[PDB]
Amino acid sequence: SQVWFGHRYSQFMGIFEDRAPVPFEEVIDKINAKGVCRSTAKYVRNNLETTAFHRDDHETDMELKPANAATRTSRGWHTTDLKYNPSRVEAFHRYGTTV
Amino acid sequence: SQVWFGHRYSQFMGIFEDRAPVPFEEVIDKINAKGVCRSTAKYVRNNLETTAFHRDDHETDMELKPANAATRTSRGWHTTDLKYNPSRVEAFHRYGTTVNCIVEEVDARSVYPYDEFVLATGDFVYMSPFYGYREGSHTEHTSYAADRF
Amino acid sequence: FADIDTVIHAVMGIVGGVVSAVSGVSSFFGALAVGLLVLAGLAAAFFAFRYVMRLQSNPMKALYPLTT
Amino acid sequence: SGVSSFFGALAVGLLVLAGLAAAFFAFRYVMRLQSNPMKALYPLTTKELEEGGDFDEAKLAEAREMIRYMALVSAMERTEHKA
Amino acid sequence: KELEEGGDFDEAKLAEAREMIRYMALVSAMERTEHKA
């Protein structure tokens, strides 16, 4: 999220969202073997290799939490419940990543 | 693509993708007449006229290449096979543009009263398939500005 | 219409490489380092300029204070 | 502002480096006049500079008094420029 | 200000000025010692 900050408000200049294919190794060794899932996502896209961090922080294996309840839906599991947006510095563009 | 570069990685801050209507002149004079398609795209959008280059490079007429094979699909032709992303300079925002010309044959389906139809991709064209200039064809329906047709 | 798999990972050698490094060093934080040097340059310019304006008029007082 | 935006990133940076350079060297020169100007101002004729009896006390007393009257010239010069 | 065949020059006066500069520098050094204290 490219958050921009006015004086007594805060905008969104852009919210880029993409889907990362969880690689084979992370599935076999962390999700299946340990039941936890990493916080970094690295994949090919537009022929340019890309790598992304959660909250622009260091790499961390995170607890896989059951998805909250819903009707007529199959099971799911996530790790992060909220989105990350950068803290406020005035009259600036700041980018905030969630994975 | 707004690519940003860390120390030992590289991110995407944003990937803006849009569709450019290939104008009449480029179709009649380059694709139909010569079989090649330009590398620049200029069109109206959000009331602001916009112009875009391929790989942020000069204008070039490019060879129209048959689309790679696929099952249960009509023919298509493109010119660029890969996307352009800027080279790396550290701790910076860099924007990289790709423009791919595409000519593609599709089916079309209209139901009664036939004042509009669809396409195989799922795009509703808001004009009777029989609207035109000959024999009261201007009676037919087109919610489009008459210059576009 | 594209290529899913392809990945684009991206004397005269001395200048370009060293230039790129320093531009990376400049980009480093450093925002205080250069600003500090610029403030020291403006400070030296100011005080030197005022000293010149104090020699332009009666140097012997500003140059020989104690014996004048 | 368009000309500034032009590349130019080296042009302005070069001028700023020349300004910081001139400020630095001028400032150091001022710090070298603030202490013993005659050596830094008259280097060659102050060149020759352990048990030295060449010193003349009355000559130094003459030089002291000269400085005072030299300052009196400077003040007279100030009045001329102002008019 | 007033600055071709100039005979106004006095060699001994210039020799006096040379020696004056040396003793003037001796004043500057004495002034340095005062400020330091």
Side-chain angles (χ1 to χ4, degrees):
Chain A
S1 34
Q2 173 165 353
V3 183
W4 184 88
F5 311 90
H7 195 62
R8 56 180 78 110
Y9 73 92
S10 183
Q11 271 234 12
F12 276 98
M13 318 275 79
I15 302 175
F16 171 85
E17 16 204 6
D18 196 4
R19 279 131 99 164
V22 175
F24 179 90
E25 32 91 355
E26 188 172 356
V27 170
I28 309 299
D29 291 313
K30 290 302 178 180
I31 306 176
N32 175 82
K34 255 81 178 183
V36 276
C37 200
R38 290 206 259 268
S39 59
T40 57
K42 188 173 187 52
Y43 55 93
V44 307
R45 182 74 87 236
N46 301 351
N47 302 263
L48 186 75
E49 208 218 42
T50 191
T51 314
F53 297 83
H54 179 38
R55 302 181 71 90
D56 290 6
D57 202 329
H58 266 74
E59 184 171 335
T60 313
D61 293 359
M62 293 219 55
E63 171 81 355
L64 268 169
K65 255 153 186 169
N68 29 7
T71 49
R72 283 184 298 277
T73 39
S74 41
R75 291 189 311 182
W77 303 266
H78 60 353
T79 50
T80 80
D81 310 4
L82 317 88
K83 276 78 175 184
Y84 168 73
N85 303 271
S87 193
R88 160 153 173 164
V89 77
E90 284 211 8
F92 253 79
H93 301 4
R94 296 199 69 192
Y95 297 8
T97 310
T98 313
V99 166
Chain B
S1 34
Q2 173 165 353
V3 183
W4 184 88
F5 311 91
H7 195 62
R8 56 180 78 110
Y9 73 92
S10 183
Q11 271 234 12
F12 276 98
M13 318 275 79
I15 302 175
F16 171 85
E17 16 204 6
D18 196 4
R19 279 131 99 164
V22 175
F24 179 90
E25 32 91 355
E26 188 172 356
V27 170
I28 309 299
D29 291 313
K30 290 302 178 180
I31 306 176
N32 175 82
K34 255 81 178 183
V36 276
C37 200
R38 290 206 259 268
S39 59
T40 57
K42 188 173 187 52
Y43 55 93
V44 307
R45 182 74 87 236
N46 301 351
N47 302 263
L48 186 75
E49 208 218 42
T50 191
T51 314
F53 297 83
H54 179 38
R55 302 181 71 90
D56 290 6
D57 202 329
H58 266 74
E59 184 171 335
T60 313
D61 293 359
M62 293 219 55
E63 171 81 355
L64 268 169
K65 255 153 186 169
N68 29 7
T71 49
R72 283 184 298 277
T73 39
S74 41
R75 291 189 311 182
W77 303 266
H78 60 353
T79 50
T80 80
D81 310 4
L82 317 88
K83 276 78 175 184
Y84 168 73
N85 303 271
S87 193
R88 160 153 173 164
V89 77
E90 284 211 8
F92 253 79
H93 301 4
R94 296 199 69 192
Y95 297 8
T97 310
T98 313
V99 166
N100 190 28
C101 170
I102 295 184
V103 165
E104 194 178 13
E105 313 185 22
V106 291
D107 291 326
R109 302 153 58 88
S110 183
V111 299
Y112 186 89
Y114 313 103
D115 55 68
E116 49 175 304
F117 56 96
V118 310
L119 293 162
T121 60
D123 315 17
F124 277 67
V125 173
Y126 290 76
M127 170 183 170
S128 173
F130 317 102
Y131 181 91
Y133 289 60
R134 301 146 69 103
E135 302 104 10
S137 300
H138 53 283
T139 303
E140 298 296 333
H141 171 273
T142 169
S143 54
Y144 283 41
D147 52 356
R148 292 179 170 270
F149 170 60
Chain C
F1 289 104
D3 204 333
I4 283 295
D5 294 326
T6 309
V7 181
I8 41 117
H9 42 57
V11 204
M12 28 31 173
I14 274 78
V15 272
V18 168
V19 157
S20 69
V22 133
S23 62
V25 173
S26 72
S27 319
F28 279 1
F29 297 95
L32 131 145
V34 151
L36 231 52
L37 168 62
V38 164
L39 294 209
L42 271 59
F46 287 9
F47 284 13
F49 172 85
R50 177 173 45 79
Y51 193 97
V52 149
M53 291 292 295
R54 291 183 181 182
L55 294 187
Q56 187 173 354
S57 64
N58 190 358
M60 312 302 297
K61 268 224 176 62
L63 241 193
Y64 284 109
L66 271 309
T67 102
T68 330
Chain D
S1 62
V3 173
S4 72
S5 319
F6 279 1
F7 297 95
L10 131 145
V12 151
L14 231 52
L15 168 62
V16 164
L17 294 209
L20 271 59
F24 287 9
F25 284 13
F27 172 85
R28 177 173 45 79
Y29 193 97
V30 149
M31 291 292 295
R32 291 183 181 182
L33 294 187
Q34 187 173 354
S35 64
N36 190 358
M38 312 302 297
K39 268 224 176 62
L41 241 193
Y42 284 109
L44 271 309
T45 102
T46 330
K47 213 165 197 185
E48 293 190 349
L49 191 147
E50 159 166 358
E51 182 245 341
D54 163 57
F55 190 88
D56 185 303
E57 320 104 1
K59 289 280 186 138
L60 182 60
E62 274 192 315
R64 267 178 235 154
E65 140 206 320
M66 168 65 82
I67 294 153
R68 313 206 230 95
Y69 281 91
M70 290 198 87
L72 272 278
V73 192
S74 303
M76 163 163 288
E77 209 142 12
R78 298 166 143 205
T79 67
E80 194 160 2
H81 162 61
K82 288 180 177 177
Chain E
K1 213 165 197 185
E2 293 190 349
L3 191 147
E4 159 166 358
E5 182 245 341
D8 163 57
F9 190 88
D10 185 303
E11 320 104 1
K13 289 280 186 138
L14 182 60
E16 274 192 315
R18 267 178 235 154
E19 140 206 320
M20 168 65 82
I21 294 153
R22 313 206 230 95
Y23 281 91
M24 290 198 87
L26 272 278
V27 192
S28 303
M30 163 163 288
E31 209 142 12
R32 298 166 143 205
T33 67
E34 194 160 2
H35 162 61
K36 288 180 177 177

